[PDB]
């Protein structure tokens, strides 16, 4: 996953 919310 890529981007600010990748962890979610």
């Amino acid at each position: 996953a890529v981007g600010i919310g990748a962890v979610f």
Epitope: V2, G3, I4, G5, A6, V7, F8
Partner: antibody, heavy 113, light 113 residues
Amino acid sequence: EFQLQQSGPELVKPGASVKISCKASGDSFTDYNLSWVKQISLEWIGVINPNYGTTTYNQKFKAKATLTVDQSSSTAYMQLNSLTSEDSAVYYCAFSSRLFGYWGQGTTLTVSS
Amino acid sequence: DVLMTQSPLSLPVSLGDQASISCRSSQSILHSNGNTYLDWYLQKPGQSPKLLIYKVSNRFSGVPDRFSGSGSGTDFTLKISRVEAEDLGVYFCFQGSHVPLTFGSGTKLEIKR
């Protein structure tokens, strides 16, 4: 194709509230989420997954911000409540997906009586 | 919260110089799932931040190879092998491992004269 669209500039009186929007569209992604970031210096407000309505907040913004989704239109909203001059800023929507992220153009909010 | 600091805050360079920007976190950015969600962004004036490097050292597609990232745990470094004019702007590191997600204060890459 891919597009990330944010609503336009807002002028709000102190103590009032405002609701701004962000929408991701295109055939280039499946699952995704949308994060809100404040710039006066970047600060993360929270994240919403529009397809599940799940949210995670920065506790700092738990009262100040409410994140919602209109699943009919796939449009995410952030409501900012009880505005002070601390809240005048640019608010970015940041899209995250399996293969790419992307930041919107930003929504400027100006608080003034 | 995980606090992110960058050094230096201002980095004057001549075109063609090597540039190094460091980022330190107050706790480790390694997530229990094994990933380290440390990203590097560039923001040009009047524009939205743009992703350069994700998860410490992965160049996003389209980012030139003069940009590279390294580090682990609490210490990270962005390097530009040879600065070009399009590189000037403010660089932010970002940790996306631990809520609230947080940004460094930013490093202004500017022209030396």
